[PDB]
């Protein structure tokens, strides 16, 4: 967690509904955007820290 991986994501479709349907995860929190709206929006990049 000190050496946290800053994976840049670019030039791709993201089916964020995978993260809702993969209910095995202990959380799927969001800030500034609703988790539904992720499936509609587009970003210049994403970072998967």
């Amino acid at each position: 967690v000190y050496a946290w991986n800053r994976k840049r994501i670019s030039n791709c479709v993201a089916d964020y509904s995978v993260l809702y349907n993969s209910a095995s995860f202990s959380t799927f929190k969001c800030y500034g955007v609703s988790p539904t709206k992720l499936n509609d929006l587009c970003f210049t990049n994403v970072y998967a820290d």
């Binding site: 509904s17 809702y20 349907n21 209910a23 539904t36």
Partner: protein, 50 residues
Amino acid sequence: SFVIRGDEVRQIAPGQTGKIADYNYKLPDDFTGCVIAWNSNNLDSKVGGN
């Protein structure tokens, strides 16, 4: 009245996603009522799957 997987109970509210809120059962956004659910594994599961 219906049976579903326990994980999917989250999909039954006003404003939701996944196969139920996608198709299998849709609430309106302004629902006037109550949702009730209970685990039914003893009745609805079987050793060879139901």
